[PDB]
Amino acid sequence: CPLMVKVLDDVRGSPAINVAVHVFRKAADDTWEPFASGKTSESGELHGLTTEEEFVEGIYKVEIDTKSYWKALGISPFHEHAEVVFTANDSGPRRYTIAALLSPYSYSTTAVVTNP
Template sequence: MMAAAESGPLTTHVLNTGDGVPASRLALSLHRLDSQLKIWSLLSVGTTDEDGRCSGLVGGEALSPGMYRLRFETGPYWESRGQTSFYPYVEVVFTISDPQQSFHLPLLMSRFSYSTYRGS
């Protein structure tokens, strides 16, 4: 599954705060929790662009109320820069109650820390 090229209702922006640059070419994936089976289903995969952004992870029709997980492959990103990291990946779990809204989920990261928030 590939992410759509156009912008969608869920976007992300990854910043390498340790080096003060966008985290370009960082792989990520979006998953949705099946509330009955309690298993995660892969919805899409993507890679950040040169500005550290990834839009179009999912089309509006694919979003429904529920729990989602955005997984950032931080270990391979740091390895590609010749560095090690304490976190091999970062998973951010969040709930969507109104799929008509737009959701922006930035990740600010260094090799030894990360933070995230719901942006606009």
């Protein structure tokens, strides 16, 4: 599993469950092509987005649907989504974990990158 996303809720001190995540890959015409998507589990994690084969080198955008998460909890948020944009696999396959720590008017995002 070469791309994983983990999301935490900093208001309630819990994993952020059922958060929609969309991944896009920058296409040759500079548009964003849908690549993969899913929802976080009860642990706040989203596994199984892609495979080593499918996950070619390129520029990827991970969009985390934070606004819907806050709306479901009955909280007024500021951001539409959290966005993480990065070049992946430029020197061969790597494994990427994108974390997002969410508050209504702020978020933090970190990447952990490991070599298989």
